[PDB]
UniProtKB/Swiss-Prot annotation:
GO terms for molecular function: aspartic-type endopeptidase activity. It comes from the Eukaryota. The keyword Signal applies. This is Endothiapepsin. The gene is EAPA. It comes from Cryphonectria parasitica (Chestnut blight fungus). GO terms for biological process: proteolysis. Its EC number is 3.4.23.22. The active site is at 35, 199. Keywords: Aspartyl protease, Disulfide bond, Hydrolase, Protease, Signal, Zymogen. Belongs to the peptidase A1 family. It catalyses: Hydrolysis of proteins with specificity similar to that of pepsin A, prefers hydrophobic residues at P1 and P1', but does not cleave 14-Ala-|-Leu-15 in the B chain of insulin or Z-Glu-Tyr. Clots milk. The lineage of its organism: Eukaryota, Fungi, Dikarya, Ascomycota, Pezizomycotina. Disulfide bonds join 255-290.
Length: 330
């Protein structure tokens, strides 16, 4: 089997991407944030505290004839940006782009943090990291991809995120028309439950490539590119007037600036992030100071190849017995 679904930026800055997901019988379609950095499929629901729901589409398990309460099961997640949510668990039928899993754990939110309430476009998350990170207690549950894997034509999914444009998540096949050149594959460590890999280095604009190992995660659920302070300093040094602002919480730059590209290494291959992808617009409405899309990972504890990086590539998440990651230009 295979599946294919269009993924759409939630706003003009590409802050996140949503993908429609069918849950239950009859289908309830929710727009979920596909997140290769986490492993829970959780949704706004009829059980969510009313004051915490503001425009989201909810899952109502009582209206799904295939929903079954998973007895005694609860979940709770606190993300690396202060965000959190929690609730109970149903199993139900879940389909993405024509690919169907029966008995998928659907984590129904009783509580969500403010940041989720305030984002009316995201109805929940669909985790695509390794099932070892799933938070369901007392019995951990499998991700959608883990449940689908054995049925797929090939045990893979691909992320093709757009810059200011729609893109695609495919399951079970590689669309060879979706990229240019070849896919370069690189080793993955699953030791922390992430799609964790080692970039071979970077360049800033048309500058010389610096060969240096950068360990990080491919994370579709993180907006920006978080890299070591040395690397980030080297990038913003090429932008006149850019500076790190403690009050704002990162590097800012004059909105009139032209940003250089940023290149990262995948083995001997190179992915070029156009400078425009690194512009996240005014720090506050009407400001002429703009927020940078490359920021320091110091104090995150890990480097993160978020959407800024991933949207410059066609990315293969290969879930073979020994997982690997593939990157191609597009």
């Amino acid at each position: 089997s295979t599946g294919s679904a269009t993924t759409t930026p939630i706003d003009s800055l590409d802050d996140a991407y949503i993908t429609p997901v069918q849950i239950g019988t009859p289908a309830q379609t929710l727009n979920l944030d596909f997140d290769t950095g986490s492993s829970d499929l959780w949704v706004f629901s009829s059980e969510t505290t009313a004051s915490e729901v503001d425009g989201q589409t909810i899952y109502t398990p009582s209206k799904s004839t295939t929903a079954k309460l998973l007895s005694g099961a609860t979940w709770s997640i606190s993300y690396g940006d202060g965000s959190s949510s929690s609730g109970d668990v149903y199993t139900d039928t879940v389909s993405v782009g024509g690919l169907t899993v029966t008995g998928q754990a659907v984590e129904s939110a009783k509580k969500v943090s403010s940041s989720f309430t305030e984002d009316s476009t995201i109805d929940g998350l669909l985790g695509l990291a390794f099932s070892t990170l799933n938070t369901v207690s007392p019995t951990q549950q499998k991700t959608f991809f883990d449940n689908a894997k054995a049925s797929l034509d090939s045990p893979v999914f691909t992320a093709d995120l757009g810059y200011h444009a729609p893109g695609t998540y495919n399951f079970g096949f590689i669309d060879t028309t979706a990229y240019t050149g070849s896919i370069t594959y690189t080793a993955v460590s699953t030791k922390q439950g992430f799609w964790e890999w080692t970039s071979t280095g970077y360049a800033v604009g048309s500058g010389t490539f610096k060969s240096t190992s950068i360990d990080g995660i491919a994370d579709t659920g993180t907006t920006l590119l978080y890299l070591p302070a040395t690397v980030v300093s080297a990038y913003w040094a090429q932008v006149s007037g850019a500076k790190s602002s403690s009050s704002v919480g990162g590097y800012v730059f004059p909105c009139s600036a032209t940003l250089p590209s940023f290149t990262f290494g995948v083995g001997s291959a190179r992915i070029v992030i156009p400078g425009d992808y690194i512009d996240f617009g005014p720090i506050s409405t009407g400001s002429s100071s703009c927020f940078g899309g490359i920021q320091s990972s110091a104090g995150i504890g890990i480097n993160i190849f978020g959407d800024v990086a991933l949207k410059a590539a066609f990315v293969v998440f290969n879930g073979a017995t020994t997982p690997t990651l593939g990157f191609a230009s597009k």
